[PDB]
Design an enzyme around this catalytic site. Structure first.
Site, PDB file in Angstrom:
ATOM      1  N   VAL A  26       0.644  -1.330  -0.203  1.00 56.48           N
ATOM      2  CA  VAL A  26       0.129   0.217  -0.237  1.00 56.48           C
ATOM      3  C   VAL A  26       1.005   1.238  -0.219  1.00 56.48           C
ATOM      4  CG1 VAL A  26      -1.942  -1.401   1.172  1.00 56.48           C
ATOM      5  CG2 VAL A  26       0.133  -0.345   2.405  1.00 56.48           C
ATOM      6  N   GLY A  27       2.537   0.820   0.683  1.00 57.30           N
ATOM      7  CA  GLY A  27       3.006   1.907   0.203  1.00 57.30           C
ATOM      8  C   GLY A  27       4.269   1.842   0.738  1.00 57.30           C
ATOM      9  N   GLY A  28      10.513   2.391   6.611  1.00 54.49           N
ATOM     10  CA  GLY A  28       9.794   1.129   6.356  1.00 54.49           C
ATOM     11  C   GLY A  28       8.614   0.807   5.253  1.00 54.49           C
ATOM     12  N   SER A  29       8.688  -0.342   4.611  1.00 53.87           N
ATOM     13  CA  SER A  29       7.497  -0.377   3.611  1.00 53.87           C
ATOM     14  C   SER A  29       5.750  -1.106   4.661  1.00 53.87           C
ATOM     15  CB  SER A  29       7.950  -1.522   2.329  1.00 53.87           C
ATOM     16  OG  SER A  29       9.113  -1.459   2.002  1.00 53.87           O
ATOM     17  N   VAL A  30       4.725  -0.584   4.171  1.00 53.81           N
ATOM     18  CA  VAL A  30       3.514  -1.299   4.276  1.00 53.81           C
ATOM     19  C   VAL A  30       2.510  -2.315   3.461  1.00 53.81           C
ATOM     20  CG1 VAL A  30       1.318  -0.274   5.776  1.00 53.81           C
ATOM     21  CG2 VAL A  30       3.690   0.592   5.623  1.00 53.81           C
ATOM     22  N   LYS A  45       3.668  -3.144   8.822  1.00 58.00           N
ATOM     23  CA  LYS A  45       4.730  -2.522   8.383  1.00 58.00           C
ATOM     24  C   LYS A  45       6.167  -2.982   8.584  1.00 58.00           C
ATOM     25  CE  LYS A  45       5.797   1.455  10.427  1.00 58.00           C
ATOM     26  NZ  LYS A  45       6.256   3.775  10.296  1.00 58.00           N
ATOM     27  N   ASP A 160       2.257   8.294  12.038  1.00 58.27           N
ATOM     28  CA  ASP A 160       4.334   8.400  12.285  1.00 58.27           C
ATOM     29  C   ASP A 160       4.207   9.974  13.225  1.00 58.27           C
ATOM     30  OD1 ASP A 160       4.046   6.215  10.157  1.00 58.27           O
ATOM     31  OD2 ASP A 160       4.490   7.810   9.049  1.00 58.27           O
TER      32      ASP A 160
END
Ligand SMILES: O=C(NCc1ccccn1)c1ccc(Oc2ccccc2)cc1
Ligand SMILES: CCCCCCCCO[C@H]1O[C@@H](CO)[C@@H](O)[C@H](O)[C@@H]1O
EC number: 2.7.11.24
Length: 331
Positions: A26-27, A28-30, A45, A160
């Site tokens: 959906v786009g 560290g990477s998530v 994540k 975040d």
């Protein structure tokens, strides 16, 4: 230890428990995922290089500590945290799991032209989450529409915290010596203005441009603010910028609820000492229909003494490992 299966999402290896199915970037990477334990959509994540450097190791620990502490309706919290590793030795990857809301506020503003009631509810929730965050002596520092997750009922959660330049406080566009929590209030102001107009308040092209647009609205520092500038050179760099008179917000946000304009005036003050706080804003008449002084909770004390310490990578990774093991999932 549950069953850990491996998969490959865009050149990246993912090892997660079987309860998490249908991983989708959906786009560290998530990655979005289906929690076969609850039947709900979650966001998983995977931190990039958790322990590549001291700074990276401290940041990993910082994030885990923050997320484990946050327990509020309008703030992202931890649903789960795990690692494929079975010991401190193999410990190298960190995965965080939380609620997947649906979309971010950035996408909501794109299409939908929000009504006054919408902006009241949305901003109310941001401030309600902020009051909680600030009560733990934590500053988000980068609040913006893409950091605000919203569901179908326009319920919001802040993402975040404690970790574009369009929503950054003018003092944090300068390296002003130690800023307070109201830098977050400035951001809320910018967000609120945009939810009201449908347009970015201060869409600067770069650093210099950003500051010039801010000053055109709020004007150059008055005498009282100038008196607090300890730096001599910074004091001239200010006056060297074109003298700008403070604009009357009523003449800027035409057609907006007068109470909304009044609140904006109290959030978008150049002098951070004069900006309304999250707690004060919640009691502003603009939120009369949502405000409940008995349902705007504060956080338990947050021990962040780790911030002042310089430790080795293995020390930060050991502390992070301890936090992973000590994790107790929500009810
Ligand atoms: O709902 C989120 N964004 C809204 C969203 C976008 C696309 C599809 C569905 N929901 C979101 C939640 C957590 C994220 O990252 C994490 C932050 C902390 C811990 C784990 C993941 C990123 C986006
Ligand atoms: C100079 C015009 C753009 C920058 C304006 C910044 C105004 C900041 O406002 C405030 O910042 C806090 C410190 O971070 C307070 O402690 C200061 O005393 C100051 O009042």
């Amino acid at each position: 230890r549950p069953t850990f299966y491996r998969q490959e999402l865009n050149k990246t290896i993912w090892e997660v428990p079987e309860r998490y199915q249908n991983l989708s970037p959906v786009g560290g990477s998530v990655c979005a995922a289906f929690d076969t334990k609850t039947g709900l959509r979650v966001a998983v994540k995977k931190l990039s290089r958790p322990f590549q450097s001291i700074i990276h190791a401290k940041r990993t620990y910082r994030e885990l500590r923050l997320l484990k502490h946050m327990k509020h309706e309008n703030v992202i919290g931890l649903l789960d945290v795990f690692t494929p590793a079975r010991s401190l030795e193999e410990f190298n990857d960190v995965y965080l799991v939380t609620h997947l809301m649906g979309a971010d506020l950035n996408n909501i503003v794109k299409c939908q032209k929000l009504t006054d009631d919408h902006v009241q509810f949305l901003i109310y929730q941001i401030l309600r989450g902020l009051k909680y965050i600030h009560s733990a002596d934590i500053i988000h520092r980068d609040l913006k529409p893409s950091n605000l997750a919203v569901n179908e009922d326009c319920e919001l959660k802040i993402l975040d915290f404690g970790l574009t330049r369009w929503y950054r406080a003018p003092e944090i566009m300068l390296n002003w010596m130690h800023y307070n929590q109201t830098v977050d209030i400035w951001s809320v102001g910018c967000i609120m203005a945009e939810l009201l107009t449908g347009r970015t308040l201060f869409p600067g092209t770069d650093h210099i441009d950003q500051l010039k647009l801010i000053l055109r609205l709020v004007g150059t520092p008055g005498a009282e603010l100038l008196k607090k500038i300890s730096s001599e050179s910074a004091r001239n760099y200010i006056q060297s910028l074109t003298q700008m008179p403070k604009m009357n917000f009523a003449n800027v946000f035409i057609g907006a609820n007068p109470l909304a304009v009044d609140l904006l005036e109290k959030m978008l003050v150049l002098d951070s000492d004069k900006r309304i706080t999250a707690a004060q804003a919640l009691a502003h008449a603009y939120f009369a229909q949502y405000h409940d002084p008995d349902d705007e909770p504060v956080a338990d004390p947050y021990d962040q003494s780790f911030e002042s310490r310089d430790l080795l990578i293995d020390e930060w990774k050991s502390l992070t490992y301890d936090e992973v093991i000590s994790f107790v999932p929500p009810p």
